[PDB]
Design a binder for this molecule. Sequence first.
Ligand SMILES: CCCCC[C@H](CC(=O)NO)C(=O)N[C@H](C(=O)N1CCC[C@H]1CO)C(C)C
Ligand SMILES: [Co+2]
Length: 205
Amino acid sequence: SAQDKLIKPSHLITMDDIIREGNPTLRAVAKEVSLPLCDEDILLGEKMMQFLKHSQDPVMAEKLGLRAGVGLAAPQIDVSKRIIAVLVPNLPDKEGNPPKEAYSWQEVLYNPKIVSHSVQDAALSDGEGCLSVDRVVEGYVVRHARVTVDYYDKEGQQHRIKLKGYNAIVVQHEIDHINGVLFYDRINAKNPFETKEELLILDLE
Ligand SMILES: CCCCC[C@H](CC(=O)NO)C(=O)N[C@H](C(=O)N1CCC[C@H]1CO)C(C)C
Ligand SMILES: [Co+2]
């Protein structure tokens, strides 16, 4: 299967492993992962985290021809399992200094689930992109401004976390993937940049 090839020790995930719009796997509902976590799944998660790290390494990304990404879900690499990886980076300050800490959030979540959320919604002012989608769909991708997520880490320990801002946006984008949902599904087709008081607009800069 695909996962088998992906977990090969010397295998590096590249755009060649990312299925695109059209493959039915993107629209399927990923299956939960068995507990305790089996080797295959844990290794896949690490491969996913490593992919993200490589994508955010300007030289490496440039060498491998990768698109900088801040998250990835198993289905995107043709594995219909509820496994997602997030790597949300901090940005430089107003003065131009590099962030004190490269990442704001780094985690591989297994069987993640949204338990509660804010009444307010939120969308990145610049819209969203997806490496599984080879085209641009402009508009505000409407998501919950804040969410509480329950998931199991690679150790197999259950966690419950409160996310907001950029972290909340990224996690929902990834969770959408394991439910067969693509970002443009959350863009108001009749008015892509529709706004409402309850809709917070996030500027990353
Ligand atoms: C924001 C919600 C999470 C996005 C995750 C995607 C990666 C992905 O395809 N996950 O499934 C990404 O990094 N997309 C990028 C993206 O949309 N970004 C990167 C910075 C913030 C935002 C731009 O508005 C594009 C540039 C490839
Ligand atoms: Co995506």
